[PDB]
Design a protein around this nucleic acid. Sequence first.
RNA 1: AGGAGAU
Length: 63
Amino acid sequence: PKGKSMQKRRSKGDRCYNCGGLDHHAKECKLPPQPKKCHFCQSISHMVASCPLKAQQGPSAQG
RNA sequence: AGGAGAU
Ligand SMILES: [Zn+2]
Ligand SMILES: [Zn+2]
């Protein structure tokens, strides 16, 4: 698992909330309604909001 | 860090 810093945001700076493409958004996607995945390990099991990795990769101290 | 395009 790897990536870069990001936050709960909208529009530019993020991608289609359904597939992960940039030329469109989740409401203009061209595939069926996918499960959204952890922005950190892509595990649908949980969310980055609970990623078992970030707990020791970037647990931060502010939110 | 959790949805819908500024949070
Ligand atoms: Zn898409
Ligand atoms: Zn995760």
